[PDB]
Structure formats: C-alpha cells, structure tokens
Amino acid sequence: LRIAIVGAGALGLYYGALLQRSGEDVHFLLRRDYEAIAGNGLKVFSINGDFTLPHVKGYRAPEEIGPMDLVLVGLKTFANSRYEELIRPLVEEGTQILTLQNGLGNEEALATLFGAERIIGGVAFLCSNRGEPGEVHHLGAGRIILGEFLPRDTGRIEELAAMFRQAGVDCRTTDDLKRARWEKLVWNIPFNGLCALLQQPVNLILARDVSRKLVRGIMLEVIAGANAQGLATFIADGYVDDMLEFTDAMGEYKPSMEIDREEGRPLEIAAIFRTPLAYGAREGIAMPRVEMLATLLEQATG
Amino acid sequence: RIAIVGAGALGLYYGALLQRSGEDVHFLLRRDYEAIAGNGLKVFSINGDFTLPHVKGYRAPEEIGPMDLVLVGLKTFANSRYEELIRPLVEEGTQILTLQNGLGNEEALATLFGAERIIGGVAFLCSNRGEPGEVHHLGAGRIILGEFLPRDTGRIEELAAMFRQAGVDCRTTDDLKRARWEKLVWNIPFNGLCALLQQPVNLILARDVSRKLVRGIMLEVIAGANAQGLATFIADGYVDDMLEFTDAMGEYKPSMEIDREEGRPLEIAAIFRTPLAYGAREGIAMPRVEMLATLLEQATGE
C-alpha cells in the first residue's frame, strides 16, 4: 500500500512515520525541511519509546510522486486554497483521500475538488508539538476514528482501520463522521479558542470557576449546533461534564492553536470556528459565545 | 478549625490551599517537622507556584487539641495508628474527613469514633512530593464529598463550599459508596499494573491485548461494585470512559509505582484486598484482581 503525506507537521509526520515503520510505502511531501530530512532522516521522539527512520522517501513537488493509492492530508487549514496544486498529481481512478485536519469544511471542499466517494475523514486525538527541522514530539494519545464522507461501504474503512492498528495506532470505525467531527468540536472550540486568545494553557482556564462556567456555555452552544445539523444520533448535554473532566487530567497542556499563536504562524479560525458557525446559522441556532470568541481571535492576531 | 493528619502529597497540598484562603490549619508533621518549622512549605503547581512563609506545625496530636474538622490524608498501612493520632483532636461536634485510597477507611473511623462524624472524600490528584517541605501539583485536584451516615446536606455543602472557596473543584454526591468503587475502576488496573511492570500508564495502554486486560480487570471491579448494595448501578461503558480518560494523561506514573521506585510500602490492603474481600463476601469471581493483588505482594516482599 502506497501513501502520500500532504501536510507534514506534527500530525502528518507522526502517522507517516508509524506507517512506514510497519512496512508501508510512504512518500513524504516536504517544504521547510527537505534538506534536513533527505540528508539525515526523521527522528520520532515518543512517550511510547523513541525511534528514528534513517532513510525517508522525501519529495518537494507533488508531480514527482505521481499517482497514489492513498493520500493523507494533515495540512493546516489556512492552506486549503492549495488543495488543487498539491493533490491533483496524486489522483488516479481508485485514489482515496484521507483528511485528519481540524474542524469542518475540509471533507466538503475536497469532495467538490476530487469526488465524494474518495473522501475518508479521520478525527484524530493527538498531543504533539514538533520540529527543529525533521523532528516529531509525541506527547500523548494518538487514536483515530475513521468515517467516510459518502456513507456507504464497509470494507474500505475497515482495511484502513486495520492498517493503522498494524502501525500501532488505536483505531476505530464509525457510521457517523459528521457527529464525531462535531464531538471533537465540543473540545476544540473552547480549548483551542480561549487558550490561544488568553495565551494560557488548559489548566489555568479550568482553574477559575467562572471560566469553567464560560467553557460549559461555549460547549452547549456547540452541541446545539451539532444536534440540529442532520445527525443519526443525538449528542447529549452530559458530554460537557465528560470533556470537562477529560481535560482536567491533561496537566499543563498547550493546545495546537495556542502554539501557533506563540510561534507567529497563522491560526485555523476558518475551519474550527467560522465554518461550524456558518453551519449553525444555516439551521438558525444561537451561538453568540462562539461568534464572540471567533471575532476576538482574528482581532488579536490580525 | 482544621487539622491535617497525613502530611503526604495530598494532605499538604489541600491543607496549604485551605490556609491560603484563610482557614485555621494545623499540620501534624512527622518526618519533616524541622524543615517546615524553620522555612515553611513551598507548593509548586501547574496553576502557579506559591509559598507559605509560616506553617502551624506540630509533632504530637495532644498539642493541637480539639478541632472542628480533621482531614485524614494518611497512607492506609498506617490505619492501625488511627486511635493515637486522631483521639486527642476529637470533641463533641468534630467531624472527620477521609481522603485516602481504597476502602474500609470510612468504616474503620466510624467504628472507632462515630458514624455521624465521618465524611468520605474521593479525591483525584496528580502529585509527587519530596524535598522535605516541598509539594508538587502536576494536575487535577478535584474532590467528591459524601457522608458515610446519610444525614443532611448543610454539613456536606458547607464543606463543599469551603473547598471551592479555596480553589478546589469540589462536588457532592448521595452515593459515597458508589464513588469509591468508581475510583477503584481506575485505581486497580493502573496503580496495579504500573507498579508491577514498573512502567507508566501510556505503555500499559499501548498494546492491544493489554487494553483488553485493563478492560477485563475493570469489568471485575464493576461486577464487585454492582452487587454491593449501591443505590444506582455502575454500567460498563464506564470502562470505555476510563480507557479514554487515562489516554489523555500521557506519560503518567501513578502513586503506587512512585512508592515502588522509592521502596516505601504499598497500599495493597485497602486498594486490592479489601475490595476483593467485599466481592467474596457477596460471592463474586474476581480472578484478575486476585492474581494482581498477589503478584503485587510477591514483587514487594523479597
């Protein structure tokens, strides 16, 4: 099975590394650290034991790779205008596209660009900061839940789930990709939002009672927008308490958006915030706290 | 009003937060009386560090005298010392709050002093200690408060309010017994396996068949819980919820593993042998908890 990794980053390189370690033909597409990876290799620093890959099949242009069986898009979503130029040379009849990037609107913009039956969505729970050119730092978790965009057929999702399980990634299969994306949004929106804005890790947002109270209300707004979107099964309100207690054992974790704010690179406001808001306002649901958060966030960074 | 009987990684932490918000806190120190009478204790947290310049410390409980509340944070192998350590602190109206691990603690103190004095607190805290008078708080800290003998709310809500004022996320339940068993679902696989294998939680969770083991251990604890006269049944699926909860903890080394590393005794009796007793009393097959308890006393006998 041959794979393209379009994105790199903490997410793309980590799953890319684990795939070739379990014997899969993985073709990396790099920009920033092409010379530091082709000359050296990529080092994975993990809590489940470090490992290094001495040789890595690395490319700096998508046309050099050619058509692929699978393509992992782990890109940051501010470069979604680059979907056409980076993915087109990898598309053959039978090519299936996997997306692990945060928020909504990613599966939909790729289905319009290539085809709905090709699109597999993966909601990934990964604790990873990264990089002095060619290094990945695995800090926690890593589990994936796989779902197809066009909802119908069993074999492909199972073959992919087993493949990630062969690579040592905890992998699950679901019938409702929409719901699982919205379930991740319940954590993503308050915690990537408030933490990037206030420039404070999750524990300090959780330490104040009134800030906890804010978090709940953000979460309930997300749930309401989720529940009236066309879900096969309803997301209960108790899930707020579940995700609240979940984050309480993450310690001093700084989420991805906060790290981007600290590193001077742009933030994924469009996919994490504006798009769920657009989908929520499409069905006419009040989401004032999300909107306020979205606005302040793009005010803060410009 | 408050006496701290324990002076471990949790008794110090909670007592330091209690007097920081202006409570009359009296610490019973043993190993490090002289280090805290000279300098005071330093609390290092993820929620910002603080230092108490002066600490009301004592070496004998008869010097402290009658109290309003005694927080017991003792390690459960010192439970034979209940009478000598707590009796001088007890007057008519004194209430005893137990925050230690496992079972039997509420009932022992109830037999010893009076059941209408006893308050059970299931606490969840990540804390290693140890530079005589230095407390490290790595995460969480939330407490669920129950009364052993089920009479009133004011008493339990006044204590809950008192903790919340001090910055402790503090809840209240009507089923203390259930909540103890709820924490046993986590404490048995993880404080068990990690101490035995001498590995952190992420490794135990990394192998597929080891997750299946954890599942099985967990299901037994639940089965031993559900036949214990609980007001409301613990469902399985609470398994899936501690499986995913522990996965957000990264490279975490539980209290029992830390105690194994430092070569100090383990709380096998309260965490393992008492619940196994409670299940056998009702006749429940718990082969895995048994094997674990036993292998764990085999490794720490030598």
In terms of domains, do A47 and A88 share one?
yes
Q: For residue B136, list chain A residues with Cβ-Cβ distance below 8 A.
A: none
**Domain boundary pick from B123, B157, B174:** B174
In terms of domains, do A58 and A151 share one?
yes
CA B253 to CA B246: how far, in whole Å? Answer: 11
Listed residue (B17, B285, B290) closest to B165, CA to CA: B17
Cα four-point dihedral sign B109, B110, B112, B116: positive
CB B142 within 8 A of CB B120: no
CB A132 within 8 A of CB A146: no
Count of CB atoms within 10 A of residue A35's CB?
13
Helix (H, G, I), strand (E, B) or coil at A273: helix
Tokens of residue A231, six digits: 């879900």
For residue A278, give its domain range. 176-302
Distance of CA B16 to the CA centre of its chain: 17
In terms of domains, do A195 and A151 share one?
no
CA A182 to CA A179: how far, in whole Å? Answer: 5
In terms of domains, do A122 and A4 share one?
yes
**Domain boundary pick from A120, A147, A175:** A175
Tokens of residue B20, six digits: 């920081």
Q: Which of residues 109-128 of A touch B (CB under 8 A)?
A: 125, 127
In terms of domains, do A131 and A145 share one?
yes
Method: X-ray
Burial of A152 (0-12, 13-18, 19+ CB in 10 A): exposed
Burial of A160 (0-12, 13-18, 19+ CB in 10 A): buried
In terms of domains, do B158 and B225 share one?
no
Listed residue (B47, B56, B51) closest to B29, CA to CA: B56
Tokens of residue A123, six digits: 């909601």
Burial of A10 (0-12, 13-18, 19+ CB in 10 A): buried
In terms of domains, do B132 and B263 share one?
no
CB A128 within 8 A of CB A168: no
For A87, the enclosing helix (H) or strand (E) is: helix A83-87
Pairing status of strand B118-126 against strand B139-147: antiparallel
| Tally of domains in chain B | 2
Helix (H, G, I), strand (E, B) or coil at B233: coil
CB A239 within 8 A of CB A48: no
Active-site residue flag, A213: no
Q: For residue A129, list chain B residues with Cβ-Cβ distance below 8 A.
A: none
Whether B244 and A248 lie within 8 Å, measured CB to CB: no
Chain A residue closest to B203 (CA)?
A48
CA A95 to CA A67: how far, in whole Å? Answer: 8
In terms of domains, do A288 and A148 share one?
no
Tokens of residue A235, six digits: 């997301």
Q: Give the one of A47, A207, A249 whose C-beta lies nearest to B202's C-beta.
A: A47
- Give buried/exposed letters for A104-113 (b at 16+ CB in 10 A, else e): bbbbebbbeb
- Where residue A103 falls (left for φ over 0; alpha for ψ -120 to 50; beta otherwise) is left
> Chain A within 8 Å of B285 (Cβ-Cβ)?
no
**Domain boundary pick from B142, B174, B206:** B174
In terms of domains, do B139 and B191 share one?
no
In terms of domains, do B261 and B150 share one?
no
In terms of domains, do A230 and A150 share one?
no
